[PDB]
Copies of this chain bind each other. A is one copy, B any other.
Amino acid sequence: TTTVGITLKDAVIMATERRVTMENFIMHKNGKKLFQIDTYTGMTIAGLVGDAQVLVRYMKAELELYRLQRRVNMPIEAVATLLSNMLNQVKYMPYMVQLLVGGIDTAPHVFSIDAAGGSVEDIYASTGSGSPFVYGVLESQYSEKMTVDEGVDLVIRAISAAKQRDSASGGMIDVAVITRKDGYVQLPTDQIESRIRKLGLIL
List residues of chain A with CB under 8 Å of any chain B CB: 20, 22, 25, 27-32, 48-54, 57, 81, 84-85, 87-88, 91-93, 112, 114, 116-122, 125, 132
What are 21 A-B pairs with beta-carbon distances under 8 A? A20-B118, A22-B120, A27-B122, A27-B125, A28-B121, A28-B125, A29-B122, A31-B120, A32-B120, A48-B116, A48-B118, A49-B118, A50-B84, A50-B87, A50-B91, A50-B114, A51-B116, A52-B118, A53-B117, A53-B118, A54-B117
Query: What are the residues of chain B within 8 A of A112 when measuring CB–CB?
Result: 27-28
Q: A49 contacts B120, CB within 8 Å? A: yes
How far apart are the CA atoms of A30 and B53 in the complex, in Å?
29
Given contacts A20-B120, A28-B120, A30-B121, 4 further A-B contacts (CB under 8 A): A22-B114, A30-B122, A51-B116, A53-B117
Query: What are the residues of chain B within 8 A of A120 when measuring CB–CB?
Result: 20, 22, 28, 31-32, 49
Q: A118 contacts B88, CB within 8 Å? A: no
Asked if A51 meets B88 with Cβ closer than 8 Å, knowing A25-B132, A27-B112, A112-B28, the reply is: yes
Residue in B closest to A132 when the chains form the complex, CB atoms: B25
Nearest chain B CB to A168 CB, angstrom units: 15
Asked if A53 meets B119 with Cβ closer than 8 Å, knowing A27-B112, A112-B27, the reply is: yes
Query: What are the residues of chain B within 8 A of A20 when measuring CB–CB?
Result: 118, 120
Query: What are the residues of chain B within 8 A of A49 when measuring CB–CB?
Result: 114, 116, 118, 120
Which of B54, B88, B116, B118 contacts A84 (CB under 8 A)? B54
Which of B31, B50, B91 contacts A116 (CB under 8 A)? B50
Query: What are the residues of chain B within 8 A of A125 when measuring CB–CB?
Result: 27-28
Across chains A and B, which 6 residue pairs bring their CB atoms closest together, nearest first? A49-B118, A50-B117, A50-B118, A50-B116, A50-B88, A28-B120
